[PDB]
């Protein structure tokens, strides 16, 4: 069960290469895509070694790197181009699907703010649901005329992508306080760390979590509540790492309660005291939950790359993420009253109203019906 990855837009093509140079480094893979001598299951991302990537000016910058053998700005303008290269790119996609044994999902890296992303990323999600109906489409989208590109795209991600947001505002903030940078070339270093540890349990043989479905299904209960958040603490026991997760000082975000938590530990900690850590957490009551439905806090273990100490990544499903939408849609209404049909942008505002409504109604004891 392999996952074909697609990368669109400048931001998407940039984070992917930094995600690729990170992944092949964790394994014994030379930049020439050849194994070096120097158990780790490597089939999920690599084909027999070539990564199952489809990259879509910046391409020249990638081929000039020593990793060469590894393989306008308006929403309307980006879409029009899509329909014109409709047939051209799908043969690239289709041939990769038939080549794989049992294709499972579609990882996509794109930015709503990015024009190409706001035009070409939006078009694929409708076509991907049309051609292949039984394939999950999960995207590592990243939030930043600017509000327009954002809200118009959110209209597609709420009905097409069945499943992670990365806000540049919080990322640029974290860069100043604990990294002291002031560029794009520095903040991307931490972005790659998130995507890498996000797919840790899949690349190493474990007991459960052997597919993308094995991670998402516990998080998303309903087709509407399909937005997640990440948190990376190390920038030592099992109880030490969790107390740093729940602090909003490290989560890249700018009543309210979670839905379900997934914890990923990449260290060699003694797995006996993890049940002791959870007990004290329930005693302290550090995070609020939903009363309506049964939910639990989960944790998983794995092994750090030996060829390269405890790290940690958390997957959070919080209703506070709705506020970020409101801020955007608020600015959208601000530009609507100041400036062929101008109707598609009207229905898009209405459908996102349901999403923010669903979350604000989710934090009530009567979210059902």
């Amino acid at each position: 069960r392999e996952i074909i990855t697609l990368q669109l837009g400048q931001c998407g093509n940039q984070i992917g290469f930094e995600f690729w140079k990170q992944l092949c480094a964790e394994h014994g893979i030379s930049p020439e895509g050849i194994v070096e001598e120097f158990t780790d299951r490597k089939d999920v991302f690599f084909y027999q070694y070539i990564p199952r990537a489809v990259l879509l000016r910046v391409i020249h910058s990638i081929l000039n790197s020593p990793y060469a053998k590894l393989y306008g700005n308006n929403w309307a303008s980006g879409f029009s181009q899509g329909e014109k290269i409709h047939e051209d790119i799908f043969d690239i996609i289709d041939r990769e699907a038939d080549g794989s044994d049992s294709l499972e999902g579609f990882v996509l890296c794109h930015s709503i703010a990015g024009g190409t992303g706001s035009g070409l990323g939006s078009y694929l999600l409708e076509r991907l649901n049309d051609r292949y109906p039984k394939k999950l489409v999960q995207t590592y989208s990243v939030f930043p005329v600017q509000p327009y590109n954002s809200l118009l795209t959110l209209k597609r991600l709420t009905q097409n992508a069945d499943c992670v947001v990365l806000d540049n505002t919080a990322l640029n903030r974290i860069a100043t306080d604990r990294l002291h940078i002031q560029s794009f070339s520095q903040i991307n270093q931490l972005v790659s760390t998130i995507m890498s540890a996000s797919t840790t349990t899949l690349r190493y043989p474990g007991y459960m979590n052997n597919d993308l479905i094995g991670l998402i299904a516990s998080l998303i209960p309903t087709p509407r509540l399909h937005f997640l958040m990440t948190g990376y603490t190390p920038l030592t026991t099992v109880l030490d790492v969790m107390r740093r997760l729940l602090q909003p000082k490290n989560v890249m975000v700018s009543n309210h309660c979670y839905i379900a938590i997934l914890n990923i530990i990449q260290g060699e900690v003694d797995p006996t005291q993890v049940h002791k850590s959870l007990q004290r957490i329930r005693e302290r009551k550090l995070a609020n939950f939903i009363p309506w439905g049964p939910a639990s806090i989960q944790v998983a273990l794995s092994r750090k790359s030996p060829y390269l100490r405890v790290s940690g990544l958390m997957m959070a499903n919080h209703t506070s993420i709705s506020s970020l939408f409101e801020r955007t849609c608020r600015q959208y209404d601000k530009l609507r009253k100041r400036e062929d049909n101008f109707d598609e942008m009207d229905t898009s505002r209405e459908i996102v109203q349901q999403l923010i409504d669903e979350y604000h109604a989710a934090t009530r004891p009567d979210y059902i019906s």
């Binding site: 007990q279 004290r280 329930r282 005693e283």
Partner: protein, 218 residues
């Protein structure tokens, strides 16, 4: 030889020290949660009017020392101790209008003096001597006797065995003044009771057997 291999290696002595420690810090946070019930709610609190039976698990090598009828006595003194911590903390957590404060010092003193007597003068005097005695254990039997001569005496100094309805009830009924006055936050009708029961307390305890005079000053 037996006592030698019993300091470690089924360390009976180490287990005994912990016993009189997990009651009689840690147990401060435990009771404070009970001030503000359920039988499972307490367990997670512990693992973090007169009931709360407490027990423990003892391995066979020390089962013969800490018998079953020994748990109840250790439980007996724990129950009474909490009621003292209760009244002491209830009158402490807060901070003819000011006339109530004169009823506070006239009372917050008395319960405080009693608490200073049970813990320090008794629950720490015999405790300091008991440890100095067990470290010279030279027998299977006498270790029971030096131990059994520690409960049956601490249950006598702390007046709980006999003369209950003659003396102990007096401290018990005046403890109800620590409950009634705590909730209200009639005033003249309290000192008429308080000055009576307190004088009833001294005019009854005046019969002093001799160690009672350490508190008879007030």
């Amino acid at each position: 030889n037996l006592m030698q291999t019993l300091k470690k290696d089924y360390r009976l002595v180490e287990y005994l020290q912990a016993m009189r420690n997990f009651f009689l810090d840690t147990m401060y946070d435990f009771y404070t949660s009970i001030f503000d019930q359920n039988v499972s709610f307490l367990n997670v609190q512990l693992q973090e009017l007169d009931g709360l039976t407490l027990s423990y698990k003892v391995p066979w090598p020390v089962d013969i020392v800490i018998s079953l009828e020994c748990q109840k006595i250790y439980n007996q003194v724990f129950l009474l101790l909490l009621q003292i911590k209760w009244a002491k903390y209830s009158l402490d957590v807060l901070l003819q209008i000011h006339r109530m404060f004169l009823l506070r010092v006239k009372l917050m003193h008395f319960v405080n003096s009693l608490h200073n007597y049970i813990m320090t003068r008794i629950l720490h005097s015999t405790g300091l001597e008991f440890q100095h005695q067990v470290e010279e254990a030279k027998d299977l039997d006498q270790l029971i006797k030096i131990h059994y001569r520690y409960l049956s005496t601490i249950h006598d100094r702390c007046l709980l065995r006999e003369k209950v309805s003659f003396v102990k009830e007096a401290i018990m009924k005046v403890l109800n003044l620590a409950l009634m006055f705590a909730d209200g936050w009639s005033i003249e009708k309290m000192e008429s009771d308080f000055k009576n029961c307190h004088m009833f307390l001294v005019t009854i305890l005046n019969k002093a057997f001799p160690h009672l005079e350490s508190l008879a000053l007030s």
